[PDB]
Amino acid sequence: FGTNGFDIPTIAIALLIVGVIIGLSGLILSIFATATASAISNPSPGTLAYNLTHPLINGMVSFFSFFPTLYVLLGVTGIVLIAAGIISIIMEKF
Amino acid sequence: FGTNGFDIPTIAIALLIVGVIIGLSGLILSIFATATASAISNPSPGTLAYNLTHPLINGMVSFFSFFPTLYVLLGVTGIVLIAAGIISIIMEKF
Amino acid sequence: FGTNGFDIPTIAIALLIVGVIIGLSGLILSIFATATASAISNPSPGTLAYNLTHPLINGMVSFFSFFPTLYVLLGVTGIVLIAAGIISIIMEKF
Amino acid sequence: FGTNGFDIPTIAIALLIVGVIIGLSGLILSIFATATASAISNPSPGTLAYNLTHPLINGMVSFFSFFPTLYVLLGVTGIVLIAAGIISIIMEKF
Amino acid sequence: FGTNGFDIPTIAIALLIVGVIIGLSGLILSIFATATASAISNPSPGTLAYNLTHPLINGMVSFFSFFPTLYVLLGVTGIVLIAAGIISIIMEKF
Amino acid sequence: FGTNGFDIPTIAIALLIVGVIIGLSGLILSIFATATASAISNPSPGTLAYNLTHPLINGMVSFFSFFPTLYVLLGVTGIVLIAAGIISIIMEKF
Amino acid sequence: FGTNGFDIPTIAIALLIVGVIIGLSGLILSIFATATASAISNPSPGTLAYNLTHPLINGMVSFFSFFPTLYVLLGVTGIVLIAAGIISIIMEKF
Numbered sequence A, B, C, D, E, F, G: 001f002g003t004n005g006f007d008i009p010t011i012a013i014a015l016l017i018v019g020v021i022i023g024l025s026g027l028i029l030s031i032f033a034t035a036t037a038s039a040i041s042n043p044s045p046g047t048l049a050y051n052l053t054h055p056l057i058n059g060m061v062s063f064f065s066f067f068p069t070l071y072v073l074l075g076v077t078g079i080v081l082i083a084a085g086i087i088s089i090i091m092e093k094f
Helices: A008-039 A048-093 B008-039 B048-093 C008-039 C048-093 D008-039 D048-093 E008-039 E048-093 F008-039 F048-093 G008-039 G048-093
Strands: none
Touching: A008 A048, A008 B008, A008 G048, A048 B008, A048 B048, B008 B048, B008 C008, B048 C008, B048 C048, B048 D008, C008 C048, C048 E008, D008 D048, D008 E008, D048 E008, D048 E048, E008 E048, E008 F008, E048 F008, E048 F048, F008 F048, G008 G048
């Protein structure tokens, strides 16, 4: 059901795959982050360990704050692909 | 699901991998730094050991303060990659 | 996840390695310097042993004072590397 | 849908491409500039570091102030192109 | 989208590249200059080291004061390029 | 982004390189000069060692006083280069 | 019941095995630790035996405090394995 490489069943399957992969990734990262939160303690506000450890958790927080827009762009990609498929169909189907 | 090398499943998997690696690194570095903090003591403000040891901990603090921006740039890289993928799709999908 | 040799997982791993190596070095040097401080005594201000020993500890102090800027430059190197990676991606990803 | 090289679908596609590229560029530059702002500190008004650093940020500000008119001219270019297309159509369509 | 070598997407990409390069350069130079400021001390106003060191920092200050106009001219170059493109389009598009 | 050999990215990169090289040179020379100042002593105003040593430090002072104008001219060179680039663009872009 | 090496019966059996092994390990370690606690006495707070023995029990306590996160990660591993199995099934079952 298509013209050259655009196959609606294939597209649906690909959507299934990406959705399940994203769900699994979120699950694993959340479960792991819980363990991370449990492991690290809060030594004191101003001792040696604080100086040694604070920037690491800051970098953690920053990167994980960067995740959302990555996911949003990844989602946007699919609309572009489906649109290109539609246009390619229309171009030479007539 | 892609054109040449841009594969949304592959991208999601790569994001999973980098996220877990960063979490593990933060965990290990924090755990190790706790041990470092425990090991070194504070001899005295002005004796021989102070002169011998202070610059080392200063270098420690400096490098670990450099970590955050490294992480931020590493995060920025992914948006660039996804954008390049989008543009490459658009260029020859039509 | 990259183009030619720029791999975000590889970069994260390298950061892990350098961080742990630097932590270990600081630990070992501090522990050793404590023993050095314990071993050497203070004979007298003006006797033979003072003349014989003072310049050595002066050189010790100087070199260890040189360490911090070495560490700072070592930290700066990584930002340069990540930046070069970003630019290399941008150049031919489009 | 055209005469020689003027194709309305092609023009619409080109507009899509330039719009998305400009959006992505703005996004990346803003995100990067946030990190730049975070990294650099304000040492003091009159010390060595101030003398060493102030002109750099001045050049930054100047160039980024030059961006707007560049964008405006880039926008103006498209009206010229479409107009040339219209005139070329009219010249030999009759 | 152009006539011979003037491509609006290419121009936007080039602007992206130059902007990011300039941002990175400013970042690196500021970070490095902070370390320079930390390293050098102020011995005394009139001793040997002062005579030996003062002209070097004077040259530093001078060159870094020369940077701004370099950046301004670099910015001016792009307006010239875009203008030449516009005129080249107009000349033979009609 | 240029015509024959004038490339704005290349120019920005070259500016980065020269700036960092100059910073490093200043750093190294200052650090070395501190050691020089520490090493040489002041024997007496009129003894043999004074006659033997004074002209050397005089030559040191003179050459280091010559550095500043060298740096200023080196800075001036870049404005000339950028100007030549602008004129070369204008000459045959129209 | 599978495709290449993913067998649900085999997975269930493996879960059985790991669960029983972990239970047995906990049992044995608890029983042994009870005997350890019985054997060692508390000589005095400040005598020779205290200096000789205290760090050993401190190391005991530390390592056994490290056990929990080891177990948590070991548990996390299985979710990853099952997820990889699911994705591998989906990839080529269609």
